[PDB]
Structures are given as structure tokens and as C-alpha cells.
Design an enzyme around this catalytic site. Structure first.
Site, PDB file in Angstrom:
ATOM      1  N   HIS A  40     -71.635 -94.686  45.568  1.00 43.03           N
ATOM      2  CA  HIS A  40     -71.936 -95.116  46.953  1.00 43.03           C
ATOM      3  C   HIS A  40     -70.726 -95.859  47.575  1.00 43.03           C
ATOM      4  CE1 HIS A  40     -73.263 -99.053  45.250  1.00 43.03           C
ATOM      5  NE2 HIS A  40     -72.841 -99.522  46.399  1.00 43.03           N
ATOM      6  N   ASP A  84     -75.212 -93.192  40.111  1.00 43.82           N
ATOM      7  CA  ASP A  84     -74.319 -93.907  41.047  1.00 43.82           C
ATOM      8  C   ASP A  84     -73.000 -94.279  40.333  1.00 43.82           C
ATOM      9  OD1 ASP A  84     -73.270 -95.129  43.267  1.00 43.82           O
ATOM     10  OD2 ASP A  84     -74.584 -96.907  43.133  1.00 43.82           O
ATOM     11  N   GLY A 175     -70.426-106.542  48.863  1.00 43.29           N
ATOM     12  CA  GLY A 175     -69.041-106.553  48.514  1.00 43.29           C
ATOM     13  C   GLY A 175     -68.758-106.525  47.024  1.00 43.29           C
ATOM     14  N   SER A 177     -70.432-104.237  45.114  1.00 46.06           N
ATOM     15  CA  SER A 177     -70.688-102.830  44.759  1.00 46.06           C
ATOM     16  C   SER A 177     -69.515-102.210  44.017  1.00 46.06           C
ATOM     17  CB  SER A 177     -70.906-101.944  45.998  1.00 46.06           C
ATOM     18  OG  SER A 177     -72.206-102.048  46.541  1.00 46.06           O
ATOM     19  N   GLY A 178     -69.829-101.469  42.964  1.00 43.61           N
ATOM     20  CA  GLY A 178     -68.831-100.722  42.232  1.00 43.61           C
ATOM     21  C   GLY A 178     -68.180-101.498  41.096  1.00 43.61           C
TER      22      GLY A 178
HETATM   23  O1  LIG Z   1     -75.438-105.341  50.095  1.00 46.38           O
HETATM   24  C1  LIG Z   1     -74.688-104.705  49.276  1.00 46.38           C
HETATM   25  O2  LIG Z   1     -73.676-104.088  49.624  1.00 46.38           O
HETATM   26  C2  LIG Z   1     -75.071-104.735  47.848  1.00 46.38           C
HETATM   27  C3  LIG Z   1     -76.140-105.430  47.286  1.00 46.38           C
HETATM   28  C4  LIG Z   1     -76.368-105.312  45.923  1.00 46.38           C
HETATM   29  C5  LIG Z   1     -75.563-104.548  45.131  1.00 46.38           C
HETATM   30  C6  LIG Z   1     -74.496-103.883  45.738  1.00 46.38           C
HETATM   31  N1  LIG Z   1     -74.254-103.989  47.069  1.00 46.38           N
HETATM   32  O1  LIG Z   2     -74.431 -99.884  50.077  1.00 47.03           O
HETATM   33  C1  LIG Z   2     -73.676-100.776  49.550  1.00 47.03           C
HETATM   34  O2  LIG Z   2     -74.022-101.547  48.638  1.00 47.03           O
HETATM   35  C2  LIG Z   2     -72.248-100.844  49.970  1.00 47.03           C
HETATM   36  C3  LIG Z   2     -71.624 -99.866  50.760  1.00 47.03           C
HETATM   37  C4  LIG Z   2     -70.285 -99.995  51.054  1.00 47.03           C
HETATM   38  C5  LIG Z   2     -69.574-101.063  50.532  1.00 47.03           C
HETATM   39  C6  LIG Z   2     -70.258-101.992  49.752  1.00 47.03           C
HETATM   40  N1  LIG Z   2     -71.569-101.854  49.444  1.00 47.03           N
HETATM   41  V   LIG Z   3     -72.683-103.100  48.148  1.00 49.99           V
END
Ligand SMILES: O=C(O)c1ccccn1
Ligand SMILES: O=C(O)c1ccccn1
Ligand SMILES: [V+3]
Ligand SMILES: [Ca+2]
Length: 223
Positions: A40, A84, A175, A177-178
Site C-alpha cells: 500500500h 501487503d 507515516g 506504514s511499510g
Molecule cells: O494512518 C496510516 O497511514 C496508518 C495507520 C496504521 C498503520 C499504517 N498506516
Molecule cells: O494507507 C496508509 O496507511 C498510508 C498510505 C500512504 C502513506 C502512508 N500510509
Molecule cells: V500508513
């Protein structure tokens, strides 16, 4: 990361920042040429930033390397976030050093109750927004699959696990994520999704990396 602590500069040397003009996702260095992140987080024009602590200040240990290719898992579902995971190839190999280091892939899956280290540059507020510019860390256990599924009925697959604290206060957030979930020296998770941050009975959900090791190895050997 909500409820965590300042890691210390370069104490998580496999942590990468993915940058497209700005930090947008974490990732994990798995060898000098390849990063693992969340599907994602896919976009074109990724620059991988290694050796980071403060993402807004050049401190002297960074390597900035454009991605040459991204490979989203063949079964990634953007609606459910099943599978993911994505691989990102560096256009030039990173120079590995004490501050820029790979993390090992699992040889087996981790148990419920195992303690893990989760890290990132995401929001540090459970209610509101504040972004740290230095890397944050959180020690968190893998939760039982039953507690995970109870929180998100019909949404958890065998390719996901939950980690954190059901009482709330400590979690990954926007922020993050990943980024990595490391347990016993192995990359066991990828920051994937959740509901809010650090809310009661809504733990974080993580991609279960141990299910993907064969795919990772075969994909990097063919690309
Ligand atoms: O809001 C976000 O971007 C989010 C929340 C939980 C895990 C990853 N990302
Ligand atoms: O959906 C998310 O968690 C997301 C998407 C883009 C960047 C960070 N997080
Ligand atoms: V995220
Ligand atoms: Ca920096």
C-alpha cells in the site's frame, strides 16, 4: 509511533525512509540492493533513504538512492490489504556499514507473545497530529490471533498478525506504514493497517513476513 521512545541515531540501521519529495513510508533493507515495504506504499518515483535519523536534517550518514523497480506482491488486494508486501530494488547498491545494514528474513514464523521492535517516523499523537523528525521505536508483543480476529472480524487473514497492547497507548500510526517489525533478529512484520492509533482493543495489524520468504528470495534472484 505513539507511546514509543526516541530510538537513538542509527540504532535501527535496517530502517529506511521512502521519499517522493517527502517521507511517506518506511521500509527495511534486506540486502545491499533490495528493500521490503508495504504494497500500500507503492508509487512511482521512489527514492530510498538509508542511514537516517532526523529526516529533515542531513547529519552525515545518509545514502539517498533512487529505486529502479518496484514489485508488488502478485496477490495484493488493496481493499483488504491481504498480501501487503512489496520489494523495491535500488538503482545502485547501498554501501553497507554500521549505520546502513540489512535485517535477516525469518526462517520460521514467530510465536504469540514474542517481543518485537517496531519503528518509524509516523505521527506520535493518539489524539491529534505531531510528526517527529527523528526515528521512534516501540517494543511490542505479538498478540494472539484470536485477540486480533476478535478486534477485526472477517478482516484478518493468515497473512496478518496483530501486535501491541489491547489497553492502548502504544502503537504504529500514520507515516509508519511499510516499516519493520523485528523479533529475535528477524523481520517478522511490516506496518500494514489498524484502526486509529493506540486506541483500546484496536491493535496494529502487520503483514506476516514469514509467509513470503520464498517469494522474496525467488523474486530478488530473478530481478
Ligand atoms: O494512518 C496510516 O497511514 C496508518 C495507520 C496504521 C498503520 C499504517 N498506516
Ligand atoms: O494507507 C496508509 O496507511 C498510508 C498510505 C500512504 C502513506 C502512508 N500510509
Ligand atoms: V500508513
Ligand atoms: Ca537526515
Amino acid at each position: 509511533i505513539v507511546g514509543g521512545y526516541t530510538c537513538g541515531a542509527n540504532t535501527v540501521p535496517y530502517q529506511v525512509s521512502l521519499n517522493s519529495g517527502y517521507h511517506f513510508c518506511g521500509g527495511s533493507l534486506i540486502n545491499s540492493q533490495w528493500v521490503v515495504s508495504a504494497a500500500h506504499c507503492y508509487k512511482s518515483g521512489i527514492q530510498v533513504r538509508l542511514g537516517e535519523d532526523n529526516i529533515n536534517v542531513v547529519e552525515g550518514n545518509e545514502q539517498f538512492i533512487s529505486a529502479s523497480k518496484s514489485i508488488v506482491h502478485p496477490s495484493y488486494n488493496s481493499n483488504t490489504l491481504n498480501n501487503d508486501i512489496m520489494l523495491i530494488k535500488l538503482k545502485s547498491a547501498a554501501s553497507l556499514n554500521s549505520r546502513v545494514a540489512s535485517i535477516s528474513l525469518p526462517t520460521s514464523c514467530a510465536s504469540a507473545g514474542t517481543q518485537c521492535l517496531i519503528s518509524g517516523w509516523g505521527n506520535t499523537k493518539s489524539s491529534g497530529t505531531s510528526y517527529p523528525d527523528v526515528l521512534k521505536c516501540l517494543k511490542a508483543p505479538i498478540l494472539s490471533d484470536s485477540s486480533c480476529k476478535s478486534a477485526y472480524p472477517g478482516q484478518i487473514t493468515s497473512n496478518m498478525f496483530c501486535a501491541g497492547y489491547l489497553e492502548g497507548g502504544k502503537d504504529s500510526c500514520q507515516g509508519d506504514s511499510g516499516g519493520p517489525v523485528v523479533c529475535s533478529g528477524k523481520l517478522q512484520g511490516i506496518v500494514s493497517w489498524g484502526s486509529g492509533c493506540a486506541q483500546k482493543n484496536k491493535p496494529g495489524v502487520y503483514t506476516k513476513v514469514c509467509n513470503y520468504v520464498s517469494w522474496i528470495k525467488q523474486t530478488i534472484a530473478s530481478n
